[PDB]
Amino acid sequence: MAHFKEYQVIGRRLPTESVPEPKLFRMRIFASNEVIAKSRYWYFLQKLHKVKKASGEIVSINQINEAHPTKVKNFGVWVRYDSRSGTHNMYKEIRDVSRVAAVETLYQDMAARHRARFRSIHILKVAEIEKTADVKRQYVKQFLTKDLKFPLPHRVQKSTKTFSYKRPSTFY
Amino acid sequence: AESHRLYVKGKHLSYQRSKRVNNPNVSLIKIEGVATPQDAQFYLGKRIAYVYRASKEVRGSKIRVMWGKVTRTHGNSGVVRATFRNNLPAKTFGASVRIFLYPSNI
Amino acid sequence: SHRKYEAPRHGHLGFLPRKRAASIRARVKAFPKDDRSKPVALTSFLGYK
Amino acid sequence: ASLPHPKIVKKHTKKFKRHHSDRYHRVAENWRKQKGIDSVVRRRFRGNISQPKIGYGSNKKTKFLSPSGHKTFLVANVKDLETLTMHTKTYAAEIAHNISAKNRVVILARAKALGIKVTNPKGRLAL
Amino acid sequence: VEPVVVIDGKGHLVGRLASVVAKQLLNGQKIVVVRAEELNISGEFFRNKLKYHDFLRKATAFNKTRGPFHFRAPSRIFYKALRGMVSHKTARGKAALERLKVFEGIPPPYDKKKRVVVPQALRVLRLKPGRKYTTLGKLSTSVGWKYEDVVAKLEAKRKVSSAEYYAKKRAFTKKVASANATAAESDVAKQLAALGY
RNA sequence: GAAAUUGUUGAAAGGGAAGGGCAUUUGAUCAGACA
RNA sequence: AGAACUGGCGAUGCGGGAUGAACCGAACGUAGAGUUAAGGUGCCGGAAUACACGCUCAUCAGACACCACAAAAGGUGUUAG
RNA sequence: GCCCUGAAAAUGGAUGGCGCUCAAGCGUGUUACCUAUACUCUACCGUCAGGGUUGAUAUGAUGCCCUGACGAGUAGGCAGGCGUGGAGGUCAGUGACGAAGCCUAGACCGUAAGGUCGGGUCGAACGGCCUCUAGUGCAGAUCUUGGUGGUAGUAGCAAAUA
RNA sequence: UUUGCUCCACACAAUAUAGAUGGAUACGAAUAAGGCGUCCUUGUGGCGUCGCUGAACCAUAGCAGGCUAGCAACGGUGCACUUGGCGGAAAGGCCUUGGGUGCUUGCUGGCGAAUUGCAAUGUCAUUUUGCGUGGGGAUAAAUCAUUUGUAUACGACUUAGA
Ligand SMILES: [Mg+2]
Ligand SMILES: [Mg+2]
Ligand SMILES: [Mg+2]
Ligand SMILES: [Mg+2]
Ligand SMILES: [Mg+2]
Ligand SMILES: [Mg+2]
Ligand SMILES: [Mg+2]
Ligand SMILES: [Mg+2]
Ligand SMILES: [Mg+2]
Ligand SMILES: [Mg+2]
Ligand SMILES: [Mg+2]
Ligand SMILES: [Mg+2]
Ligand SMILES: [Mg+2]
Ligand SMILES: [Mg+2]
Ligand SMILES: [Mg+2]
Ligand SMILES: [Mg+2]
Ligand SMILES: [Mg+2]
Ligand SMILES: [Mg+2]
Ligand SMILES: [Mg+2]
Ligand SMILES: [Mg+2]
Ligand SMILES: [Mg+2]
Ligand SMILES: [Mg+2]
Ligand SMILES: [Mg+2]
Ligand SMILES: [Mg+2]
Ligand SMILES: [Mg+2]
Ligand SMILES: [Mg+2]
Ligand SMILES: [Mg+2]
Ligand SMILES: [Mg+2]
Ligand SMILES: [Mg+2]
Ligand SMILES: [Mg+2]
Ligand SMILES: [Mg+2]
Ligand SMILES: [Mg+2]
Ligand SMILES: [Mg+2]
Ligand SMILES: [Mg+2]
Ligand SMILES: [Mg+2]
Ligand SMILES: [Mg+2]
Ligand SMILES: [Mg+2]
Ligand SMILES: [Mg+2]
Ligand SMILES: [Mg+2]
Ligand SMILES: [Mg+2]
Ligand SMILES: [Mg+2]
Ligand SMILES: [Mg+2]
Ligand SMILES: [Mg+2]
Ligand SMILES: [Mg+2]
Ligand SMILES: [Mg+2]
Ligand SMILES: [Mg+2]
Ligand SMILES: [Mg+2]
Ligand SMILES: [Mg+2]
Ligand SMILES: [Mg+2]
Ligand SMILES: [Mg+2]
Ligand SMILES: [Mg+2]
Ligand SMILES: [Mg+2]
Ligand SMILES: [Mg+2]
């Protein structure tokens, strides 16, 4: 659904006489702007509490920035989704440099592999896998062998003009 | 010397148009060596001449010219729209055209 | 509706058009495969019926 | 020699010819409105002839001005012609079609004297 | 850019060569395409063969003469892909098409005139490596074209003469380089360096 | 002494109809305005 | 075939859906300049053979609402769970 | 999930066509770009509204001036107009030095009905303006009467012995 | 049929033009591989180097390019000759010899340019044809009518006729 930021959103049920100071619940929400983010918040609260937005208020909204945006990280990702004939839990591992980047490729992947649009997914948890060897999916492990190296065979230069006078070479 | 060219080579391509409706009042011009709208911004305002020939001599010549100006860029690949004194004939879609260097700003 | 009884078409579609030839002298559309080992000779001959 | 005026704009020079007036002789080009129920013209489908309608109306300023800037006024004799004696920057005389040859030279003469423009001096001219 | 552009068909993808050729024509660029027998179509040989027989069945039921025409030649296959991308029943379209010439092999004029390529339709630059594809020459012969052998023969002949031409030239520019060499390290030379030459 | 329709002459266009709309090239033709 | 509420077509062109009464967009005096809708931008055709991550190879692949159809059931094809 | 089997109809044939395979395919994301009689600004037409202006000594008070907004349309309603035959009035209107009519990819006015002029033909009458009046406007009605085509130099003009 | 035809030459007239305006600048083959240089044991060889676009290469100064002088080179190039050879895929074009002649911006000189008035394509290309001029060259046939019947509805076909 876009290029994500991650938000803390904090909300509560409106105060009353016999209950001032209602409890205060927070969610981390991945969305592209704060309007989508406050909406997602109410979406999920109404799956957990007796509230709706008409009887609650957003207390705070705050964008959370990646702590080490240029440290490569192995993410564990947990997702719930809906298929055409049923709904299902999944665990994926993603390797990127920020939760935000991680979540963007997830939704991409879910769309491409499973045909899940944004409406049909629930991020249940996104967490940095600290020690390797608790990294579980091979398509990632592959990339943490010692002294890793690889070529990119069959190089494809982009032409800038419609006619060439050479005959390209895919060397690299 | 051998070259005397003081203009940029160019080509009459289309009228401004829809899928199914054209508008003779605006002509579309591809300019040699202009690949992008940024490149094409240079030529905005430059003057175009479509130079053609005829059998009847007129003011002592068998050569005639339809004059116009470049007015804005067009799309992403350095094509340009232009208007003329009189709309270009349309047998000329694919005919050559001359983009001068005046009015100059360098 | 469908014939009723099946019967083979009349005449051969490989001899169309059934127009008059472009000349009395029918053309030799094809000559024998050449075998350059043998002596030179004609491969056809003109006559009258 | 005519009152100065803003550039005359005509909006629709092309004649509004009746539909199919090109298609059967029996149909004159004179404008006539389609009233048929199915008619492409009346329904105004892309591609067919325009119909006359009030947007085409000319600038109140330049209306009735012919190219020179004068309105034309039909003239049958000197007396008619003299109704324009204080209006030569603004109206121009046209000599009526049924005015005689000899009677045009009188009119043509007086018009010259009064500085009145004449739209068709060459008529019936004894050349 | 140049008055006539000669494209070496070999290793190009039919419909992508077609799409750019049609365009150049429409903009007034004369084009001649050569070695159309060495053209490619993606998809393995059988598929395109099947596709072609699909083409073959279409004909005017009352008179096969007025119905769609099936040209077997690799150049005419190619022209078909082209003509299909040009509003060819208009005068502008006819005009465009006259700017076009398509050949099997590289016949005179063009064998001594340079030919170019079109990278955005170069098979080796477009098809994922691994994917099966089809040579036009072979596709044509299987649907009737009669002259692969005699193109092959002429080409092989032509290719001999051009390797000579080449050998000579490469020998002439070894000298020419042995010139740009004395001249090196001279005043005029480093002066030209300075200005990027 | 209209029109349909016809002969001649002149000009023009015409790859399975013709005619029409917006627009310009070309040709032919013409008004006005200038002092 | 027959009812309910609204919105339309009929009575209405215009842009889109190739095509089409009813769908999408948008309702019309004569025009200039600008910006858009719905819908598009390889070529036909105005507009990126743009960018990015995946998936897909079909000896009857697939390709955009209304819409011009396909099902049960199967696969040690391949993908992710 | 994509792909494959499951998957049979009649003229040859349709993701609109060409064609496309790390797509020009399918899912999803991000920019840019094209273009409606729509939106914005401006001119001009007309409609509706709200103002202003009898003060001579010049010309429309149904006038003139300022301002705002609006404009689809069958059946149908109303309005302001164009055109014909005839009638009262008027212009002491046009005309044998050529009325009327007719012809004219010549001109000009009008959004239009139409109006005006030139040239050619012609031969005896005719028109502007205010009014009055109706047997007052045609493309259709298998409309009426007359005239004329393509069909076409075509079908044919071949029974009864010559 | 009132001196016709054809190739070369130039002169005038006309008619065009799907669109000149420095140059279409020649290996082949591979792409999970190649180009070039160099050596060698000549090979699926050693060694070097290059790419990452033609953003190149070549050409390019002079009244649209005038008139002139000189030097250094002996190089470049235009033209018309002439020598030897190559190319049939549509060769109709490529290469080579030799003298002649022009130009040379390789370098250094003398003169000229204005008024086209502050821009107006400012005209420099290549199609086809027509009329005469004189330098070469060449001096037919088909059709109607007649006729055959290997042919035929009519045309057509096929024969025959100094
Ligand atoms: Mg963090
Ligand atoms: Mg049967
Ligand atoms: Mg014959
Ligand atoms: Mg009617
Ligand atoms: Mg009807
Ligand atoms: Mg209807
Ligand atoms: Mg008579
Ligand atoms: Mg004519
Ligand atoms: Mg016109
Ligand atoms: Mg609705
Ligand atoms: Mg009804
Ligand atoms: Mg409607
Ligand atoms: Mg449409
Ligand atoms: Mg459709
Ligand atoms: Mg097409
Ligand atoms: Mg385009
Ligand atoms: Mg872009
Ligand atoms: Mg659906
Ligand atoms: Mg599966
Ligand atoms: Mg399909
Ligand atoms: Mg398409
Ligand atoms: Mg996509
Ligand atoms: Mg408008
Ligand atoms: Mg407005
Ligand atoms: Mg209305
Ligand atoms: Mg009246
Ligand atoms: Mg009357
Ligand atoms: Mg009466
Ligand atoms: Mg007429
Ligand atoms: Mg006039
Ligand atoms: Mg007269
Ligand atoms: Mg008269
Ligand atoms: Mg009489
Ligand atoms: Mg009255
Ligand atoms: Mg009546
Ligand atoms: Mg009527
Ligand atoms: Mg009638
Ligand atoms: Mg009728
Ligand atoms: Mg009627
Ligand atoms: Mg009748
Ligand atoms: Mg009759
Ligand atoms: Mg007869
Ligand atoms: Mg007969
Ligand atoms: Mg009989
Ligand atoms: Mg042309
Ligand atoms: Mg190497
Ligand atoms: Mg080597
Ligand atoms: Mg080696
Ligand atoms: Mg180079
Ligand atoms: Mg010089
Ligand atoms: Mg050729
Ligand atoms: Mg000098
Ligand atoms: Mg001669």
Short mmCIF file of C-alpha atoms (C1' of nucleotides) in Angstrom, two decimals, chain D residues 10-11 15-16 18 24 26 30-32 42 44 52-54 56-60 63-67 74 77 94-104 120 123-124, chain H residues 37 43-46 58-59 71-75 91-101 107-114 116-119 126-127 137-140:
data_model
loop_
_atom_site.label_atom_id
_atom_site.label_comp_id
_atom_site.label_asym_id
_atom_site.label_seq_id
_atom_site.Cartn_x
_atom_site.Cartn_y
_atom_site.Cartn_z
CA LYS D 10 -16.47 36.92 -37.63
CA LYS D 11 -16.62 33.74 -35.48
CA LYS D 15 -22.11 29.09 -44.57
CA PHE D 16 -24.53 26.88 -42.57
CA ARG D 18 -28.88 22.45 -44.79
CA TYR D 24 -30.45 15.57 -53.27
CA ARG D 26 -34.59 18.85 -54.10
CA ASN D 30 -30.98 27.46 -47.20
CA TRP D 31 -30.70 26.64 -43.49
CA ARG D 32 -33.40 24.38 -42.21
CA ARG D 42 -30.05 17.28 -34.60
CA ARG D 44 -25.13 16.60 -32.70
CA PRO D 52 -26.54 28.07 -36.43
CA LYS D 53 -27.01 29.18 -32.80
CA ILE D 54 -26.64 32.36 -30.76
CA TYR D 56 -21.92 32.75 -33.13
CA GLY D 57 -23.42 36.28 -32.89
CA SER D 58 -21.05 39.14 -33.76
CA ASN D 59 -19.53 41.75 -31.47
CA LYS D 60 -22.13 44.43 -30.90
CA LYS D 63 -21.68 44.11 -36.26
CA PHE D 64 -23.06 45.21 -39.66
CA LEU D 65 -19.68 46.79 -40.41
CA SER D 66 -18.47 45.67 -43.77
CA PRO D 67 -14.69 45.47 -44.29
CA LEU D 74 -29.18 51.37 -49.84
CA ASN D 77 -31.42 58.72 -55.81
CA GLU D 94 -24.86 51.41 -52.17
CA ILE D 95 -26.74 52.30 -55.31
CA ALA D 96 -29.88 50.18 -55.73
CA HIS D 97 -29.85 47.48 -58.41
CA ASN D 98 -32.72 49.01 -60.40
CA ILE D 99 -31.23 52.51 -60.65
CA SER D 100 -30.63 53.57 -64.24
CA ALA D 101 -27.30 54.20 -65.87
CA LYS D 102 -27.71 57.93 -66.37
CA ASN D 103 -29.19 58.27 -62.85
CA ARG D 104 -26.10 56.66 -61.32
CA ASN D 120 -20.43 50.02 -56.09
CA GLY D 123 -22.20 49.61 -61.81
CA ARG D 124 -23.70 50.24 -65.24
"C1'" U H 37 -17.95 19.92 -24.80
"C1'" A H 43 -12.65 37.96 -24.75
"C1'" C H 44 -17.36 37.90 -27.51
"C1'" C H 45 -23.09 36.35 -28.18
"C1'" G H 46 -27.57 35.84 -25.90
"C1'" A H 58 -28.94 66.89 -31.57
"C1'" U H 59 -30.16 61.80 -33.39
"C1'" G H 71 -26.66 28.73 -21.36
"C1'" A H 72 -27.97 20.18 -22.74
"C1'" G H 73 -32.95 19.06 -24.68
"C1'" U H 74 -37.73 14.84 -27.72
"C1'" A H 75 -43.32 15.71 -26.82
"C1'" C H 91 -41.55 57.75 -49.72
"C1'" A H 92 -44.28 63.72 -55.11
"C1'" G H 93 -39.99 55.55 -54.29
"C1'" U H 94 -37.55 52.30 -59.07
"C1'" G H 95 -38.10 51.80 -64.44
"C1'" A H 96 -37.93 51.19 -72.13
"C1'" C H 97 -31.15 55.53 -70.82
"C1'" G H 98 -34.33 48.61 -69.43
"C1'" A H 99 -39.45 46.96 -64.38
"C1'" A H 100 -40.12 41.78 -63.29
"C1'" G H 101 -38.16 36.98 -63.90
"C1'" A H 107 -18.72 40.61 -53.85
"C1'" C H 108 -21.00 42.22 -48.99
"C1'" C H 109 -24.51 42.19 -44.34
"C1'" G H 110 -27.03 38.65 -40.81
"C1'" U H 111 -26.08 33.09 -35.47
"C1'" A H 112 -30.35 32.01 -39.00
"C1'" A H 113 -34.94 32.37 -41.65
"C1'" G H 114 -32.93 35.66 -45.41
"C1'" U H 116 -27.92 43.47 -50.55
"C1'" C H 117 -24.69 44.38 -54.98
"C1'" G H 118 -21.91 43.30 -59.71
"C1'" G H 119 -21.96 40.70 -64.58
"C1'" C H 126 -42.14 46.91 -59.69
"C1'" G H 127 -40.22 48.03 -54.52
"C1'" G H 137 -43.49 28.90 -46.69
"C1'" C H 138 -42.76 21.26 -48.38
"C1'" A H 139 -38.37 16.37 -49.06
"C1'" G H 140 -41.42 12.75 -47.68
#
